[PDB]
């Protein structure tokens, strides 16, 4: 069929055998595991797990995932823990990609997993800047991204898109200041979800 | 259709002018007021009534796809005329 | 090692708000009502959290709406109103909470159309 | 498949030495850089002479704005706002009402110049080729407020280019 | 193209190549800047019967992750092992 | 006791006896698309986007007036349903006028979006279509009745909760028309809420002509004030102007309904 | 009731990491205003330290407490190695910022904000 | 126009010493060139 | 004997299988200190069982790196010691011992 | 130890030196953040679109196919054959793009000015590819979810032809400026050298692993639209430094050439986006006659079409690595989130590792052999 995405069962179900595989050797730690329609495998973990998957996932013969793809986070207010924390791994031995998922929230510190990945060390600055997640034993952890002294994080979604303030240079006192932000347009909010559900497949439960 | 206010500013054809007593027209001093002189409900009132001799009519602006999407207009109402809401032609049953 | 901790939660001082915009809003939590021009029921499904609205006002230059209220797009979803009421309270909000309107349901019938001594009987179709 | 591109054992033998070391003392590889150097001094440059020549560019260039006319002067635009709707930068503001004949016509439309992306998402917006992006990209100004420009702007540059811009749609509407 | 033929000798040798075969400057070889109009083909969904959208709507065939397993024999790997790339029969090493 | 059982894609659900089809599916979740029917008004099933299939039953029946019988399976996503969907949206699509960026409703259309999810992704008809000429009914409803689909909701809203026997159909067939006949204004303490309900863009509200497009308004929940009886409303605004207001639906107050001085 | 902590157990283990924190900040305002040459006093400087860590005197949970102590120590951090510039150190004191109203009477006159 | 020069030097403009009032013969500007002979210069089109 | 693994720091490794019968044995030896019903002894078991029987029935080491895929023979060795090194990480970690803790309801729940 | 505070956007180096020695490198970045994920979550699906030409900027289409295959595979659609090898020529054409900014600005960094006229001319010859398809020479915006914007006009295949014909010998006029040369090479060789099993655990990718002579690109792994039809070799490193990968991005020239005949011979006929009207807007003579393509362009243009709920990593082999996007989708029309995988922010982040026992002067080299834009690394 021209116009539609092709399945691929043999990835679905290899992925699918593995995350069985991986649930049944850290049942310690893994709380969900899925396999998308695209064929793309979820661990989903608890937050002290952190560590101990990573470092079996990168070096478990079977497993091998020595590469961070990304690592990142997800904000979901309604959540009591709103931050996802999400880890995208590759093998190259098995050609395969994997996402490890836990959660945290404010004030709970994350495990630093630059132990195991060097590449961590800036996605976890990253996070730490943009949504305010504490990570534990990191060599650095500190601001990568905001200006000196910014204040709040502003991939949080309660985070204003303009932010609070805005620079601009003053002659009186002959530097750049910072002062509250006003817009001479404000931003346009547009409503644009229709209220004809589009995707039943996706139907929650009343 | 432009006409200047008691104060010699142009109107524009959204009838926009400022006031008598409005600072903001200083901003013209030494400059100008840009206004577009060929009033578009001038232009299309020119046009003539196009004569056809069916209840029903069709308008796509002119140019095939370079015009507007194709509209019906009903001419049964003998008092006026049926004006196409896109570009304004107006049409008329003989 | 877990410890102990018996305080509400609060994360005022640790968000970087303005202290302006923390206790001078009033935010509002409800599930916003249909819009009537539409029979689709889909937008009322979750719950919303929004602040009151402040001053707009016409640009010098160009009349636009200008705007000093950096909350004023602000606009979170919720999947309860629990959920909702949890958020405002760690955040320091005020608000008021709306409990959601349902429609009740109705009793139909096609038949009723041509009641034999009822007042339901149409007189068109 | 691959291929190394640095992976190569240099000969021993006496011939293959002397080789390398008169390319060491006789700087043999750097006078073969002065060979190509010196050819291109040699051949045309590449360079036009701008105002009076001009890059040359396509009938689908996105330059500056401007609102169309019909033939008969009527403005394409009806106040749809799908433009408005699916500008990327927010550039586009529209008003509109009824006109004094009835007609659904804007009574505002700024583009701001120094929002917008030059995208062209407008004019594949646009159901009645009202806005378009013109030709021109040869309109820089001396201050910011010249470029926020309002509907008056924008008609005038209709008229303005529109000899240029209807043969330019011409040239390219079969493939939109 | 308009150099003289010692010039030319000039910069071949001292390029070490043929540089009149492969001149960096445009000339006649160009497309012609104006061209017919292309007339474009129509895609497949573009039939008169046959053509329910149900059984072409890529989304709705779309379903939520099969859960696995969730906290409400021999081993295995990922995928099955890479294969070892092969070295190019086109030119092994530079 | 009363109750009996019926299912819903499988899933089980008690109704009391006289639940439509429709009704049984708003009890999981599953809104069925409509025109004609609302449930404020009485039914019609004319309009036929309703239309659903009934496990083991080789006809769709019309969800909105049909009664659900018991031991009943309602597939609202079966090939059948969908097709039946297709169909009936293929045909009110066929005269409809291309006004979309002309008219008003653009934006926040029944039409529109139950095209978009549930009718095809292209046209098949390749004839000319039908235009009828516009009536005046006052003031305050412009119509353009090109756009009209003919669901009569705006009929049984005036004849049923205005009390007003003004609306009606004359002719047959595909030249049937809504209107008065005779030249004749809708002037009603009620007659604004006939905007609100008509699903297209046929009768549309005067003064708000052209003003505005639904994405690009806020909603602001207020309470109306023009009398006593404290009708629940939206406010729309935009850029710091009210363009409009609404009602808000509230079953102990206004339900869904204004007048046209709130409005 | 039972979290994870992220450095204290209890509130007097992390009011010795404020006071350690403060004492830090106190010493480093007279290098600060000499390297940004910054027109204001030292006791300014201090005033300053003390009023930012005033408005925080009302925390009562130990993880708040080391969150702020944490990002506290950022922000000393980022003085100290003179990554800010001189515009961030003065950004504390808001001197262009006119004095806003905050009595009901000159709130009324101004405008419609609370 | 000169088609024996490569490809971007095959159309010039020699501008007006003098345009709308304004004296041009030193200060020319690329915006003087008016539409309809803006598509050939810039090889918008072939035919002038 | 090659002269290069190809990978940079990837030494070539003048005695691969002695190598890897030391390394493979030394890692069951650290597998029997984890309980027998634990999944990662029994599945790292299994998987170091059939590589150390393929290198004792394979003195080739050319024919013995397309029995084992694992890329270069250094490379096997590499993931050898990567396993022997996790191996008694998870003695510490016993990542077989239940759940530590479910989440809260809705943790995993999208859209939500 | 001296203190420099300061040593493609703009970067602050806050370095230590020992003397000579580079003894710490502590980039200090954000200089040009402008906070485009928060962004994308105020646009639509195709309002997103152009976020991704503004990323990587030498690499304008690249970016756009990463983010339309995301949305694409979120979608369950497909793009049609001959907008799949539209994708991979323009996609080979952005290679030689951004190699052409990366080998010559390097060389312009250390001194070595010449080539960068010689190949931005033949940039600009590219430029005009771009222009002529899109009607912008950089920002095309015309790769999207669904396909391309337009098709092909008339007489561009020609034109590509053309130059693919003389380019090869462009490329060996830069190598003969570079390659042998002494001083080229004193720069280069064994400056930065990376393990290849340090280059896989820092996150490295693209040149920056298969320099170090890991065998891995995912045009050839994890292939995406045509590339599984075309035939190429990947070049490797032996060395890990930055003459071996100076000498594959040299090489990856080449077969970007090799690619590009083949997609110009094996160019198909037929639609350049895909036939259905929910996800690409109908063509605008249906859009101005048929009442369905006019309700689907007025919907396709103010809300934009739907995503099913879901959440993917979509990656591919950009010129400069591996770019990836995370991209959630909450069911509406505006993704609930999307995070930008730059391939330059890992190899940023490691530059302090690969700089440590040389000189100021190789810090300048690393930066250059590691080819890095800050709007990619901030966003
Ligand atoms: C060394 C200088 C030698 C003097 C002779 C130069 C000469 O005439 O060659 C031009 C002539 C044209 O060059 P081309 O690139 O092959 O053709 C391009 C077009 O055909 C060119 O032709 P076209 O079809 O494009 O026609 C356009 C052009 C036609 O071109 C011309 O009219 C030629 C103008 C060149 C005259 C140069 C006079 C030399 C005075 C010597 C003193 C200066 C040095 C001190 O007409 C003009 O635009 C005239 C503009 C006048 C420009 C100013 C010239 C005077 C400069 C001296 C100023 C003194 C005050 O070249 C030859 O005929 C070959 C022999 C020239 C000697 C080559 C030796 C190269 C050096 C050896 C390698 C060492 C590297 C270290
Ligand atoms: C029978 C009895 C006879 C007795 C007498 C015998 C003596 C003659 C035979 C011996 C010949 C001696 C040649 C002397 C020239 C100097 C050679 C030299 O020093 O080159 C080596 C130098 C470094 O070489 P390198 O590859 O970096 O590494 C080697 C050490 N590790 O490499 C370099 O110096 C490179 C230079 C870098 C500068 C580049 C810019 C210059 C390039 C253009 C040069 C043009 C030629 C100059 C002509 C001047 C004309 C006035
Ligand atoms: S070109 Fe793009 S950014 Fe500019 S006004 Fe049009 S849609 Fe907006
Ligand atoms: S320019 Fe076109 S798209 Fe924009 S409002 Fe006018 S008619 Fe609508
Ligand atoms: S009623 Fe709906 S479908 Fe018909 S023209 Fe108006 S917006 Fe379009
Ligand atoms: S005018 Fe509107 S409400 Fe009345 S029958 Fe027609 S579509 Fe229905
Ligand atoms: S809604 Fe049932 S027939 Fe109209
Ligand atoms: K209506
Ligand atoms: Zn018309």
Redesign the pocket.
């Known amino acids: 069929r021209p116009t539609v995405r092709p399945r691929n069962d043999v990835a679905h179900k290899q992925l699918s055998a593995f995350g069985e595989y991986v649930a049944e050797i850290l049942p310690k730690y893994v709380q969900q595991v899925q396999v998308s329609c695209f064929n793309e495998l979820e661990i989903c973990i608890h937050p002290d797990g952190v560590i101990p998957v990573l470092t079996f996932l990168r070096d478990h013969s079977n497993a091998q995932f020595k590469s961070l793809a990304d690592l990142t986070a997800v904000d979901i207010p309604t959540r009591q823990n709103r931050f996802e924390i999400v880890y995208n791994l590759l093998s190259l031995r098995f050609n395969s990609r994997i996402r490890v998922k836990t959660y945290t929230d404010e004030l709970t510190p994350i495990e630093s997993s630059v132990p195991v990945y060097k590449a961590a060390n800036w996605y976890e600055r990253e996070i730490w800047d943009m949504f305010g997640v504490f990570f534990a034993n990191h060599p650095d952890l500190r601001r990568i991204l905001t200006d000196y002294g910014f204040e709040g994080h502003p991939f949080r979604k309660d985070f204003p898109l303009s932010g609070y303030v805005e620079l601009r240079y003053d002659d009186e006192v002959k530097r750049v200041v910072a002062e509250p932000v006003e817009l001479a347009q404000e931003f346009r909010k547009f409503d644009l979800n229709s209220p004809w559900e589009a995707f039943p497949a996706y139907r929650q439960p009343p | 259709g432009v006409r200047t206010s008691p104060t010699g500013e142009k109107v524009t054809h959204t009838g926009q002018v400022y006031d008598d007593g409005d600072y903001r027209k200083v901003r013209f001093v030494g400059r100008q007021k840009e206004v577009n002189e060929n009033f578009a409900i001038d232009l299309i009132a020119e046009q003539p009534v196009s004569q056809v001799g069916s209840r029903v009519i069709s308008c796509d602006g002119g140019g095939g796809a370079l015009g507007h999407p194709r509209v019906y207009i009903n001419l049964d109402k003998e008092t006026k005329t049926g004006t196409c809401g896109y570009c304004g032609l107006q049409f008329r049953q003989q | 090692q877990l410890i102990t901790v018996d305080e509400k939660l609060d994360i005022t001082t640790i968000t970087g708000v303005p202290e302006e915009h923390i206790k001078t809003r009033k935010a509002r939590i409800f599930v916003p009502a249909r819009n009537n021009m539409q029979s689709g029921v889909n937008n009322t499904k979750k719950w919303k959290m929004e602040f009151d609205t402040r001053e707009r006002w016409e640009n010098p230059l160009m009349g636009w709406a200008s705007t000093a209220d950096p909350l004023s797009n602000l606009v979170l979803t919720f999947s309860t109103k629990e959920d909702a009421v949890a958020f405002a309270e760690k955040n320091g909000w005020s608000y008021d909470v709306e409990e959601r309107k349902v429609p009740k349901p109705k009793s139909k019938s096609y038949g009723a159309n041509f009641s034999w001594n009822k007042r339901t009987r149409v007189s068109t179709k | 498949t691959y291929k190394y591109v640095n992976l190569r054992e240099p000969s021993m033998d006496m011939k293959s030495v002397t080789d390398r070391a008169a390319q060491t003392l006789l700087w043999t590889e750097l006078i073969r850089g002065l060979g190509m150097t010196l050819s291109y001094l040699f051949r045309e440059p590449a360079t036009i002479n701008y105002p009076f020549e001009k890059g040359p560019l396509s009938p689908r260039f996105r330059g500056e704005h401007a609102?169309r006319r019909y033939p008969s002067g009527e403005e394409?635009?009806?106040?749809?706002?799908?433009?408005?709707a699916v500008c990327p930068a927010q550039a586009?503001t529209?008003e509109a009402e009824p006109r004094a004949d009835g007609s659904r016509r804007?009574t505002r439309?700024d583009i701001d110049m120094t929002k917008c992306i030059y995208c062209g998402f407008?004019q594949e917006?646009?159901?009645?080729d009202?806005?378009v992006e013109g030709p021109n990209f040869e309109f820089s100004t001396e201050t910011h407020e010249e470029l926020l420009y309002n509907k008056e702007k924008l008609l005038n540059n209709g008229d303005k280019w529109e000899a240029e811009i209807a043969a330019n749609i011409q040239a390219d509407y079969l493939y939109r | 193209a308009s150099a003289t033929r010692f010039i030319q000798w000039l910069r071949n040798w001292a390029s070490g190549r043929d540089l009149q075969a492969k001149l960096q400057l445009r000339y006649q070889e160009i497309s012609k800047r104006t061209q017919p109009p292309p007339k474009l083909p129509v895609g497949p969904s573009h039939k008169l019967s046959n053509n329910y959208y149900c059984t072409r709507d890529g989304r709705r065939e779309a379903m939520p992750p099969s859960i696995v397993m969730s906290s409400q024999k021999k081993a295995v790997s990922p995928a099955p092992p890479i294969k070892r790339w092969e070295l190019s029969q086109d030119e092994p090493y530079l | 006791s009363n109750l009996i059982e019926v299912f819903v894609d499988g899933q089980s659900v008690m109704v009391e006896p006289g639940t439509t089809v429709l009704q049984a599916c708003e009890k999981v979740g599953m809104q069925i698309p409509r025109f004609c029917y609302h449930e404020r008004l009485s039914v019609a099933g004319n309009c036929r986007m309703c239309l659903v299939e009934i496990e083991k039953a080789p006809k769709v029946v019309a969800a909105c007036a049909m009664p659900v019988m018991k031991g009943w399976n309602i597939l609202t996503n079966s090939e059948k349903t969908k097709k039946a969907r297709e169909g009936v949206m293929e045909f009110l699509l066929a005269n409809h006028p291309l006004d979309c960026?002309i008219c008003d409703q653009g934006g926040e259309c029944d039409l529109q979006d139950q095209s978009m999810m549930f009718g095809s992704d292209r046209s098949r008809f390749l004839e000319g279509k039908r235009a009828v000429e516009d009536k005046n009914i006052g003031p305050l409803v412009k119509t353009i009745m090109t756009r009209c689909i003919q669901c009569t909701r705006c009929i049984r809203f005036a004849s049923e909760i205005a009390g007003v026997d003004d609306l009606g159909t004359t002719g047959r067939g595909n030249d049937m028309q809504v209107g008065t006949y005779i030249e004749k204004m809708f002037m009603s303490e009620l007659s604004g809420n006939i905007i609100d309900i008509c699903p297209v863009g046929a009768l549309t509200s005067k003064p708000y002509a052209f003003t505005a497009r639904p994405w690009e308004t806020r909603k602001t929940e207020s309470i109306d004030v023009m009398d006593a009886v404290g009708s629940n409303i939206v406010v729309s605004t935009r850029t710091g102007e009210v363009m409009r207001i609404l009602p808000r639906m509230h079953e102990d107050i206004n339900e869904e309904w204004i007048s046209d001085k709130t409005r | 009731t039972s979290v994870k902590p992220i450095f204290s157990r209890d509130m007097n283990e992390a009011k010795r990491r404020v006071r350690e924190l403060y004492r830090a900040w106190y010493r480093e305002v007279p290098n600060t205003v000499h390297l940004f040459q910054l027109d204001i006093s030292v006791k300014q400087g201090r005033d300053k330290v003390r009023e930012m860590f005033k408005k925080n005197a009302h925390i009562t949970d130990p993880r708040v407490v080391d969150l702020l102590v944490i990002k506290g120590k950022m922000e000393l951090e980022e003085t100290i190695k003179v990554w800010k510039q001189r515009t961030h150190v003065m950004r504390f004191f808001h001197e262009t910022e006119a004095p806003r109203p905050k009595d009901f009477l000159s709130k009324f006159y101004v405008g419609h904000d609370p | 126009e000169d088609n024996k020069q490569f490809f971007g030097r095959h159309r010039w403009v020699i501008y007006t010493t003098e345009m709308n009032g304004k004296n041009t013969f030193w200060d020319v500007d690329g915006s003087m060139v008016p539409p309809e002979w803006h598509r050939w210069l810039h090889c918008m089109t072939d035919d002038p | 004997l090659k002269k290069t693994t190809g990978l940079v720091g990837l030494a070539v490794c003048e005695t691969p299988h002695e190598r890897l019968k030391i390394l493979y044995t030394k890692i069951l030896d650290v597998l029997g200190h984890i309980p027998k019903n634990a999944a990662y002894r029994k599945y790292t078991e299994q998987i170091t069982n059939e590589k150390l029987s393929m290198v004792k029935a394979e003195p080739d080491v050319k024919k013995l790196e397309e029995r084992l895929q694992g890329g270069q023979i250094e490379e096997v060795i590499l993931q050898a010691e990567n396993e022997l090194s996790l191996a008694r990480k998870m003695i510490q970690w016993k990542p077989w011992e239940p759940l530590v803790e479910e989440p809260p309801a809705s943790q995993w729940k999208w859209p939500i | 130890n001296l203190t420099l505070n300061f040593g493609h956007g703009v970067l602050r180096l806050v370095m230590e030196l020992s003397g000579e020695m580079v003894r710490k490198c502590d980039p200090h970045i954000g200089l040009l953040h402008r906070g485009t994920e928060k962004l994308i979550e105020y646009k639509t699906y195709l309002q997103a679109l152009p976020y991704f030409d503004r990323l990587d900027y030498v690499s304008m289409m690249c970016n756009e196919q990463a983010y339309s295959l995301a949305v694409e595979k979120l979608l369950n659609i497909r793009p049609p054959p001959r907008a799949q090898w539209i994708r991979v020529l323009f996609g080979e054409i952005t290679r030689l793009l951004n190699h052409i900014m990366a080998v010559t600005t390097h060389a312009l960094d250390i001194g070595a000015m010449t080539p960068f006229f010689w190949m931005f001319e033949e940039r600009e010859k590219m430029f005009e590819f771009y222009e002529r398809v899109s009607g912008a020479r950089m920002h095309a915006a015309y790769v999207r979810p669904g396909g391309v914007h337009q098709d092909l006009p008339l007489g561009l295949m020609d034109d590509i032809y053309e130059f693919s014909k003389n380019f090869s010998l462009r490329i060996d006029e830069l190598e003969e400026m570079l390659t042998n040369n002494r001083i080229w090479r004193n720069r280069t060789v064994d400056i930065g050298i990376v393990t290849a099993e340090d280059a896989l655990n820092y996150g490295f990718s693209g040149v920056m692993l298969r320099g170090s002579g890991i065998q891995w690109d995912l045009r050839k792994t994890q292939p995406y639209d045509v590339y599984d039809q075309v035939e190429f070799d990947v070049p490797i490193g032996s060395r890990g430094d930055c003459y071996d990968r100076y000498l594959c991005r040299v090489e990856e020239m080449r077969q970007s050439i090799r690619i590009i005949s083949q997609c110009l011979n094996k160019m198909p006929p037929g639609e350049i986006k895909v036939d259905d009207a929910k996800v690409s807007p109908p063509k605008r003579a249906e859009m101005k006659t048929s009442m369905e393509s006019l309700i689907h362009h007025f919907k396709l243009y103010t809300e934009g079409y739907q995503v099913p709920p879901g959440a993917t990593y979509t990656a591919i082999e950009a010129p400069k690595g591996e770019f990836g996007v995370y991209l959630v989708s909450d069911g509406s029309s505006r993704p609930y989130r999307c995070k930008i995988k730059a391939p330059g922010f890992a190899h940023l982040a490691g530059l302090d590792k690969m700089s440590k026992g040389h000189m100021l002067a190789d810090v300048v080299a690393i930066i250059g052999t590691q080819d890095i834009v800050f709007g990619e690394v901030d966003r």
């Open positions: 609102l394409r635009c009806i106040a749809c706002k799908l433009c408005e586009i529209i804007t439309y407008c917006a646009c159901p009645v009202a806005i | 960026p």
